[PDB]
Design an enzyme around this catalytic site. Structure first.
Site, PDB file in Angstrom:
ATOM      1  N   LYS A   1       0.712  -1.385   0.111  1.00 25.74           N
ATOM      2  CA  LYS A   1       0.122  -0.194  -0.100  1.00 25.74           C
ATOM      3  C   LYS A   1       0.858   1.132   0.004  1.00 25.74           C
ATOM      4  O   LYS A   1       0.273   2.342  -0.275  1.00 25.74           O
ATOM      5  CB  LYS A   1      -0.819  -0.173   1.213  1.00 25.74           C
ATOM      6  CG  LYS A   1      -2.077  -1.235   1.217  1.00 25.74           C
ATOM      7  CD  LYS A   1      -2.538  -1.163   2.465  1.00 25.74           C
ATOM      8  CE  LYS A   1      -3.322  -2.620   2.844  1.00 25.74           C
ATOM      9  NZ  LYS A   1      -3.623  -2.611   4.184  1.00 25.74           N
TER      10      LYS A   1
ATOM     11  N   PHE B   1      13.481  -5.086   2.562  1.00 23.24           N
ATOM     12  CA  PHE B   1      14.711  -5.700   3.117  1.00 23.24           C
ATOM     13  C   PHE B   1      14.210  -6.514   4.356  1.00 23.24           C
ATOM     14  O   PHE B   1      14.462  -7.909   4.621  1.00 23.24           O
ATOM     15  CB  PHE B   1      15.934  -4.911   3.673  1.00 23.24           C
ATOM     16  CG  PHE B   1      16.644  -5.135   4.752  1.00 23.24           C
ATOM     17  CD1 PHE B   1      17.525  -6.049   5.064  1.00 23.24           C
ATOM     18  CD2 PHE B   1      16.812  -3.932   5.965  1.00 23.24           C
ATOM     19  CE1 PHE B   1      18.311  -6.223   6.139  1.00 23.24           C
ATOM     20  CE2 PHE B   1      17.616  -4.072   6.814  1.00 23.24           C
ATOM     21  CZ  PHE B   1      18.335  -5.396   6.942  1.00 23.24           C
TER      22      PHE B   1
ATOM     23  N   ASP C   1      12.365 -11.900   7.052  1.00 18.65           N
ATOM     24  CA  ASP C   1      11.387 -12.375   7.875  1.00 18.65           C
ATOM     25  C   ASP C   1      10.481 -13.625   7.382  1.00 18.65           C
ATOM     26  O   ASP C   1      10.494 -14.564   7.985  1.00 18.65           O
ATOM     27  CB  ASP C   1      10.241 -11.216   8.305  1.00 18.65           C
ATOM     28  CG  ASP C   1      11.000 -10.210   9.351  1.00 18.65           C
ATOM     29  OD1 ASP C   1      12.232 -10.491   9.894  1.00 18.65           O
ATOM     30  OD2 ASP C   1      10.403  -9.128   9.616  1.00 18.65           O
TER      31      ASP C   1
ATOM     32  N   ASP D   1      10.510 -16.999   9.299  1.00 17.65           N
ATOM     33  CA  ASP D   1       9.487 -17.833   9.902  1.00 17.65           C
ATOM     34  C   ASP D   1       8.969 -18.820   8.931  1.00 17.65           C
ATOM     35  O   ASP D   1       7.852 -19.157   9.107  1.00 17.65           O
ATOM     36  CB  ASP D   1       8.407 -16.731  10.220  1.00 17.65           C
ATOM     37  CG  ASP D   1       7.933 -15.764   9.453  1.00 17.65           C
ATOM     38  OD1 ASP D   1       7.834 -16.207   8.417  1.00 17.65           O
ATOM     39  OD2 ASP D   1       7.400 -14.790   9.900  1.00 17.65           O
TER      40      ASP D   1
ATOM     41  N   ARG E   1       3.078 -13.848   0.616  1.00 22.66           N
ATOM     42  CA  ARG E   1       3.132 -12.482   1.220  1.00 22.66           C
ATOM     43  C   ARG E   1       2.469 -11.731  -0.001  1.00 22.66           C
ATOM     44  O   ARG E   1       2.609 -11.840  -1.100  1.00 22.66           O
ATOM     45  CB  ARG E   1       4.661 -12.014   1.449  1.00 22.66           C
ATOM     46  CG  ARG E   1       4.910 -10.485   0.835  1.00 22.66           C
ATOM     47  CD  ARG E   1       5.063  -9.558   2.057  1.00 22.66           C
ATOM     48  NE  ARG E   1       5.876 -10.281   3.420  1.00 22.66           N
ATOM     49  CZ  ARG E   1       5.518  -9.838   4.645  1.00 22.66           C
ATOM     50  NH1 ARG E   1       4.687  -8.928   5.115  1.00 22.66           N
ATOM     51  NH2 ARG E   1       6.447 -10.481   5.867  1.00 22.66           N
TER      52      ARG E   1
ATOM     53  N   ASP F   1      11.641 -10.934  19.201  1.00 20.00           N
ATOM     54  CA  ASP F   1      10.374 -11.790  18.732  1.00 20.00           C
ATOM     55  C   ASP F   1      10.715 -13.078  18.684  1.00 20.00           C
ATOM     56  O   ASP F   1      10.191 -13.854  19.100  1.00 20.00           O
ATOM     57  CB  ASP F   1       9.914 -11.233  17.485  1.00 20.00           C
ATOM     58  CG  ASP F   1       8.536 -11.652  16.998  1.00 20.00           C
ATOM     59  OD1 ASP F   1       7.545 -11.661  17.972  1.00 20.00           O
ATOM     60  OD2 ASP F   1       8.190 -11.346  15.794  1.00 20.00           O
TER      61      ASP F   1
ATOM     62  N   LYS G   1      10.324  -3.694  16.948  1.00 19.82           N
ATOM     63  CA  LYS G   1      10.199  -4.412  15.526  1.00 19.82           C
ATOM     64  C   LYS G   1       9.364  -3.701  14.670  1.00 19.82           C
ATOM     65  O   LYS G   1       9.575  -3.876  13.387  1.00 19.82           O
ATOM     66  CB  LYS G   1       9.558  -5.763  15.803  1.00 19.82           C
ATOM     67  CG  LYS G   1       9.737  -6.874  14.617  1.00 19.82           C
ATOM     68  CD  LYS G   1       9.124  -8.050  14.817  1.00 19.82           C
ATOM     69  CE  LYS G   1       8.698  -8.740  13.465  1.00 19.82           C
ATOM     70  NZ  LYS G   1       8.766 -10.012  13.319  1.00 19.82           N
TER      71      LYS G   1
ATOM     72  N   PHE H   1      -1.639   0.853  16.678  1.00 18.77           N
ATOM     73  CA  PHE H   1      -1.478   0.068  15.193  1.00 18.77           C
ATOM     74  C   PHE H   1      -1.560  -1.387  15.404  1.00 18.77           C
ATOM     75  O   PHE H   1      -2.232  -2.051  14.591  1.00 18.77           O
ATOM     76  CB  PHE H   1      -0.464   0.716  14.187  1.00 18.77           C
ATOM     77  CG  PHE H   1      -0.466   0.047  12.809  1.00 18.77           C
ATOM     78  CD1 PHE H   1      -1.347   0.518  11.902  1.00 18.77           C
ATOM     79  CD2 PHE H   1       0.450  -0.859  12.738  1.00 18.77           C
ATOM     80  CE1 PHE H   1      -1.427  -0.481  10.665  1.00 18.77           C
ATOM     81  CE2 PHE H   1       0.551  -1.470  11.446  1.00 18.77           C
ATOM     82  CZ  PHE H   1      -0.563  -1.274  10.408  1.00 18.77           C
TER      83      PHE H   1
ATOM     84  N   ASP I   1      -4.047  -4.424  14.695  1.00 17.74           N
ATOM     85  CA  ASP I   1      -3.766  -5.207  13.808  1.00 17.74           C
ATOM     86  C   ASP I   1      -3.977  -6.593  14.413  1.00 17.74           C
ATOM     87  O   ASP I   1      -4.543  -7.439  13.773  1.00 17.74           O
ATOM     88  CB  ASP I   1      -2.438  -4.965  13.194  1.00 17.74           C
ATOM     89  CG  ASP I   1      -1.916  -5.944  12.035  1.00 17.74           C
ATOM     90  OD1 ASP I   1      -2.395  -5.873  11.105  1.00 17.74           O
ATOM     91  OD2 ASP I   1      -1.081  -6.919  12.283  1.00 17.74           O
ATOM     92  N   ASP I   2      -3.295  -6.893  15.525  1.00 16.58           N
ATOM     93  CA  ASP I   2      -3.546  -8.203  16.227  1.00 16.58           C
ATOM     94  C   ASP I   2      -5.053  -8.529  16.628  1.00 16.58           C
ATOM     95  O   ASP I   2      -5.431  -9.823  16.287  1.00 16.58           O
ATOM     96  CB  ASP I   2      -2.942  -8.230  17.572  1.00 16.58           C
ATOM     97  CG  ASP I   2      -1.410  -8.150  17.439  1.00 16.58           C
ATOM     98  OD1 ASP I   2      -0.756  -8.299  16.426  1.00 16.58           O
ATOM     99  OD2 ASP I   2      -0.607  -8.213  18.440  1.00 16.58           O
TER     100      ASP I   2
HETATM  101  O1  LIG Z   1       0.006  -0.162   5.141  1.00 10.77           O
HETATM  102  C1  LIG Z   1       0.014  -0.957   5.897  1.00 10.77           C
HETATM  103  O2  LIG Z   1       1.237  -1.646   6.189  1.00 10.77           O
HETATM  104  C2  LIG Z   1      -1.190  -1.296   6.718  1.00 10.77           C
HETATM  105  C3  LIG Z   1      -1.487  -2.621   7.094  1.00 10.77           C
HETATM  106  C4  LIG Z   1      -2.764  -3.125   7.540  1.00 10.77           C
HETATM  107  C5  LIG Z   1      -3.585  -2.228   8.034  1.00 10.77           C
HETATM  108  C6  LIG Z   1      -3.315  -0.800   7.549  1.00 10.77           C
HETATM  109  C7  LIG Z   1      -1.955  -0.507   7.086  1.00 10.77           C
HETATM  110  O3  LIG Z   1      -2.283   0.856   6.700  1.00 10.77           O
HETATM  111  C8  LIG Z   1      -2.391   1.941   7.830  1.00 10.77           C
HETATM  112  C9  LIG Z   1      -1.606   3.302   7.472  1.00 10.77           C
HETATM  113  C10 LIG Z   1      -1.992   4.504   6.798  1.00 10.77           C
HETATM  114  C11 LIG Z   1      -1.206   5.568   6.583  1.00 10.77           C
HETATM  115  C12 LIG Z   1      -0.009   5.701   7.105  1.00 10.77           C
HETATM  116  C13 LIG Z   1       0.644   4.521   7.669  1.00 10.77           C
HETATM  117  C14 LIG Z   1       1.964   4.645   8.429  1.00 10.77           C
HETATM  118  C15 LIG Z   1       2.716   3.281   9.051  1.00 10.77           C
HETATM  119  C16 LIG Z   1       1.767   2.322   9.011  1.00 10.77           C
HETATM  120  C17 LIG Z   1       0.373   2.245   8.554  1.00 10.77           C
HETATM  121  C18 LIG Z   1      -0.168   3.358   7.983  1.00 10.77           C
HETATM  122 MG   LIG Z   2      -0.452  -9.056  12.075  1.00 13.73          MG
END
Ligand SMILES: O=C(O)c1ccccc1OCc1cccc2ccccc12
Ligand SMILES: [Mg+2]
Ligand SMILES: O=C(O)c1ccccc1OCc1cccc2ccccc12
Ligand SMILES: [Mg+2]
Lengths: 345, 345
Positions: free
Chosen positions: B50, B91, B96, B100, B105, B167, B193, B232, B236-237
């Site tokens: 993303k 990287f 990772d 694991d 992915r 971890d 991490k 975050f 996510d968990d």
């Molecule tokens: O993008 C991802 O890895 C992601 C994976 C799962 C759920 C939502 C996610 O994105 C949200 C997101 C939006 C804007 C800035 C961000 C900056 C750092 C981390 C996440 C961020």
């Molecule tokens: Mg997860």
């Protein structure tokens, strides 16, 4: 011996290196277990070798810096930067042992082969690499050559990784394709994978520490050092098979391992179509009789005489390179190294 | 949407990134094959996600830099530094996935699982990391924040590697030891991490590019960003199990994988000795009925209600942190991020 003189002070500095690296856990006790694992990684992988690359930093620094500017703090920095070279090599060797499925290193079980380690060694290798930049920050951040050293270690890592990519593409595991084993490919692998970090990096690091940052002086030192690196690897390939294990401290396996050795490169350049078939059928096999057949073909092609002629021409060429490109550096910086590499043992 | 607005210009800059990185082979044709492999590594591993972390650099830069100082060259540097964040993540993810033993992915075969790749991916991962410093040198070496960015990327790599060590020690493959799954350990893993590289690094990079190098301003931004990083990962968990796969774009496996999830941490804090036995016997197993039993225990312990209360308290706390620690930065820098992370989807 300038190396045997500096060795004990260099090895003794390792306890301080470990202490300083494992002293970031004081303010952060939560990472204590990861820091204890880091200590184990350092102790197993950075100790045990001959330390020739790291010692070269120390030796060259003492020859490049005015004896009055060689205070206690400056020498600690030289020993630290020498240890950064050893850590850079340790990072490469831990990762390379995983990639080529090695069993032992320095007669000891490879780190990843230790029970409970396995593929966690990928992370352990990344930590060894991270330790270089932690040490450069801790000891050299207020020095005018700080950025020069960071960029030098990063460039040497990139060059080595490029050389490793080149090596992996040339000898893919299971693919016995001798068409890839050209002299030009061999020379590029050696240059990138070993010559830059082994010969250029230690001297260049000592030059930056001595305030010798000129692009021309570095290009001149590099021209000498990459040529020494090329000879070092060619001699190492020759001794892998024709060396005395009691003298070299190793029993070679390049033939069994399908290596793009200087010996096979030379063999391919001189082999008749029938001689090529003999090599095609016996190279990369673990059977003793099959390895003896490759050795026999090499002796039939007079590769030991070709090597000896090469050693003589290479030594003349390195002295000619020193004569032309050493100035304004003391020729002793390169001569000390040439004697260590070319002396017949 | 500021992210959806910058996305196309960011993704389109990737062709230039690849071009500039694979344009070092012009002067050195001997490394052409290694450079072609590098291009393949970049294309497979840096594309497909993303790009939220890399886009955050671009978004924060445009909010931190005066619109007059936002010339064509400055924006190219912002897109390049955003791509360095994505390369740093690539990287970590390649390495990772090897450690694991992952299969896929982003719904695609893991790079190391591709035929002909295997453990050569260790070297491919080292190259992705080397690309960060090649790009920083190529685009930012004449900038006053050059050293600040190098040190920031090196520190973020070290922190992440420390978090990965933590971890790996907490969930050793084959060792189902729930005694290690404490709240304090969970929080340290997340902090090192994921929180540092995911939240602190992108904003801190944009701050250095904007000339905001003060230790206090960075400590203040870090205090907000590490707390956002913690929420975050907890969310996510939670969504790994209780999320809707049609909305999240993923079917979770944390229970099957013996993960030190926030859910299991909370379960262990609330379980009676009998409830602990149910979790001890069913956690880390691939059987659907066994995973359903863990989910059932979580619902019995009212973990969705505990999460919802936590989400509410966390959101109030992050707004209180923004109010106290944003100045002199525009609160919008943190608010834009908070909305992206906390919005109920
Ligand atoms: O993008 C991802 O890895 C992601 C994976 C799962 C759920 C939502 C996610 O994105 C949200 C997101 C939006 C804007 C800035 C961000 C900056 C750092 C981390 C996440 C961020
Ligand atoms: Mg997860
Ligand atoms: O030490 C080794 O890896 C090594 C392995 C096999 C044979 C000889 C070796 O050492 C020779 C050597 C002496 C002094 C400085 C050096 C600098 C860079 C490389 C080698 C050096
Ligand atoms: Mg050898």
């Amino acid at each position: 011996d300038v190396y045997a003189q500096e060795k004990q002070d260099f090895v003794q500095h390792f306890s301080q290196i470990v202490r300083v690296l494992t002293e970031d856990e004081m303010g952060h006790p939560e990472i204590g277990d990861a820091i204890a694992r880091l200590k184990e990684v350092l102790e197993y992988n950075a100790i045990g070798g001959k330390y020739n690359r790291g010692l070269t930093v120390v030796v060259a620094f003492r020859e490049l810096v005015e004896p009055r500017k060689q205070d206690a703090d400056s020498l600690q920095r030289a020993w630290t930067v020498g240890w950064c070279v050893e850590l850079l090599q340790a990072f490469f060797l831990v990762a390379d042992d995983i990639m080529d499925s090695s069993l032992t290193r320095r007669g000891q079980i490879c780190w990843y082969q230790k029970p409970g380690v396995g593929l966690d060694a990928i992370n352990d290798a990344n930590l060894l690499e991270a330790c270089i930049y932690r040490l450069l920050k801790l000891y050299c951040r207020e020095q005018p050559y700080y950025l020069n050293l960071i960029e030098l270690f990063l460039q040497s890592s990139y060059q080595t990784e490029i050389g490793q990519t080149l090596d992996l593409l040339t000898a893919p595991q299971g693919n016995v394709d001798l068409v890839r084993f050209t002299e030009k490919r061999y020379k590029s692998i050696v240059k990138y994978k070993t010559a830059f970090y082994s010969f250029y990096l230690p001297i260049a690091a000592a030059m930056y520490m001595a305030g010798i940052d000129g692009e021309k002086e570095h290009a001149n030192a590099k021209k000498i050092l990459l040529e020494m690196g090329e000879f070092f690897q060619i001699q190492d390939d020759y001794l892998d098979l024709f060396g005395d294990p009691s003298v070299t401290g190793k029993i070679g396996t390049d033939i069994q391992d399908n290596k793009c050795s200087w010996l096979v490169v030379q063999c391919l350049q001189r082999a008749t179509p029938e001689q090529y078939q003999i090599l095609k059928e016996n190279y990369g096999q673990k059977e003793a009789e099959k390895v003896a057949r490759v050795k026999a073909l090499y002796e039939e092609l007079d590769l030991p005489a070709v090597f000896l002629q090469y050693e003589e021409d290479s030594y003349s060429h390195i002295m000619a390179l020193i004569e032309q490109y050493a100035a304004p550096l003391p020729p002793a910086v390169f001569l000390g190294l040439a004697r260590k590499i070319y002396k017949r043992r």
